[PDB]
Design a protein around this ligand. Structure first.
Ligand SMILES: C[C@@H](C(=O)Nc1cncc2ccccc12)c1cccc(F)c1
Ligand SMILES: C[C@@H](C(=O)Nc1cncc2ccccc12)c1cccc(F)c1
Lengths: 306, 306
């Protein structure tokens, strides 16, 4: 038993991180087959970032202006192109350690592991969620750009996030691996507004089921509720409204615990209206929304990866 | 900026995990050079665990009773010995993926990463601390035995923990890699008492410094205090007493923030006596003690590993 914020094992991703240098700028790249993917703002100086014209900046660059280093192996660039906000550097050597992989654009509320890197080398790994306002609450310093977020399914690494920037508010923004930003953000040093950050209700419920599986049952009450009545309370506290798709996803946790989803919503409503009163749930004094229903099943059943 | 419970990258450890089978029991082993290390209770049945005589059980076993599998590679056992609570299986093939490594016995309050494994295959990675009562609050299911805890320093993997058992209270107990249990526990299915679990005060302080580095300054007050006066308050709340060694360790964080250690203790005292009053610190409604002062410097300076 027990419950932890668990990340995926990172070994398959560690072998894909390289260092990309263009002029004075050095950031991280992802080396899959014979292509390196990195943030396009590697071609900017500190002054260019206030208002970059990426097309005009990229035209003054040739293949030999990019230095790609994988530890002590120097890859030679033989082709380069800009795809949205990502640079694609075609190199002469295909990565031998290339895993089975795919590129995926996740939806808000889904979770993934981040491998934080600096100078092409791994620093640490942690789990996080894409917020409903398309930001992540990460841990990143200058030079972490190009670090990637990923999931693992069976033997396949699904890359879903590449880190680009820290907003003046301290939260983090980035793109999918096709270079499309998550959210309305642009890769330019200007004040940018993220929306209201709401709580991922379906995740909170999956975590309450995890608490029950692990012996924490005090929040369970005798009341019940309806989907419409619950959503009226949830929206007052800036919780995401619950839909029937969410009830279907929670089904397996309902079956394993014998607690109906709407009964769990009733318990949640009282926690919203009356607080936690100095008690804790799974060691936390706050309601936690960084576990999806799949995360809970995974951890509580012991799913492994090849 | 930002602050996350960050684990070490696990790639160097993933290549060392193997599956060990003896009769009907299968658990995880750690394969370094030509030796496999695993919990000695792999030689027990479900009935033997109530009162095992490990010497008598091990005598009825020969080299060919142990099946060691690394994915699809079958290692052949050519020697076996029992060292305290760990079995050492000498195999015919030295692990090619053996990293630079060492065995270390950590002290309570230090932190490490756990690679949770099942059937020799990685499942997830998370960070945790050795509690002052020598338990860990992990996330482990049946079959996770033999999963290891580790740190990384430069290029060297320091193995410090091997998982053996879940106590009837739901917390976890294990050994160093020489097979000596942390704490007073024995590898036998019997009711066992862990001591009082106290809060690691030096870790709480390092985390308050992390909060200040990250812009959370509301808990800072104008008061100050003395080491003796603080420890009198700390011991009332089951906090570990602070020593001069702890003040020396916190020095670099004091220098970077310009806040004297004793001034930080004063802030902590008021948080202990008056609570947090519904506010949060680094996203938490509880005081967090799973970050050492080194963890904080690491994350806030961007230390990488080769
Ligand atoms: C320079 C870069 C950026 O924000 N990098 C960073 C990423 N993560 C964390 C950081 C922490 C401190 C300083 C910089 C950090 C950037 C700026 C503007 C637009 C853009 F696309 C990229
Ligand atoms: C059987 C084994 C043990 O506790 N294994 C486990 C380790 N971790 C988590 C678990 C979760 C559920 C069930 C078993 C778990 C053991 C028992 C007694 C003494 C001993 F040395 C080992």
């Amino acid at each position: 038993s027990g419950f932890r914020k668990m990340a995926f094992p990172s070994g398959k991703v560690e072998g894909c991180m390289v260092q990309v240098t263009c002029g004075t700028t050095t950031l991280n790249g992802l080396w899959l087959d014979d292509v390196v993917y990195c943030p396009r703002h590697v071609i900017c100086t500190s002054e260019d970032m206030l208002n970059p014209n990426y097309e005009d900046l990229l035209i003054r660059k040739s293949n030999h202006n990019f230095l790609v280093q994988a530890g002590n192996v120097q890859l030679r660039v033989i082709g380069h192109s800009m795809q949205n906000c990502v640079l694609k550097l075609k190199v002469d050597t295909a990565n031998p350690k290339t895993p089975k992989y795919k590129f995926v654009r996740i939806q808000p509320g889904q979770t993934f592991s981040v491998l934080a890197c600096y100078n092409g080398s791994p620093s640490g790994v942690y789990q996080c969620a894409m917020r409903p306002n398309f930001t992540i609450k990460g841990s990143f310093l200058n030079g972490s750009c190009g670090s990637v977020g990923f999931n693992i399914d069976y033997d396949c690494v699904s890359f879903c996030y590449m880190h680009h920037m820290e907003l003046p508010t301290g939260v983090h923004a980035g793109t999918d691996l096709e270079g499309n930003f998550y959210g309305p953000f642009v890769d330019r040093q200007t004040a940018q507004a993220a929306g209201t950050d709401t709580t991922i209700t379906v995740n909170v419920l999956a975590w309450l089921y995890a608490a029950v599986i692990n012996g924490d049952r005090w929040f369970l009450n005798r009341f019940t509720t309806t989907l419409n009545d619950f959503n009226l309370v949830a929206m007052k506290y800036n919780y995401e409204p619950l839909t029937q798709d969410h009830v279907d996803i929670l089904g397996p946790l309902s079956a394993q615990t014998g607690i109906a989803v709407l009964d769990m919503c009733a318990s949640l409503k009282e926690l919203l209206q009356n607080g936690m009163n100095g008690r804790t749930i799974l060691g936390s004094a706050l309601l936690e929304d960084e576990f999806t229903p799949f995360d809970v099943v995974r951890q509580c059943s012991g799913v492994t990866f090849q």
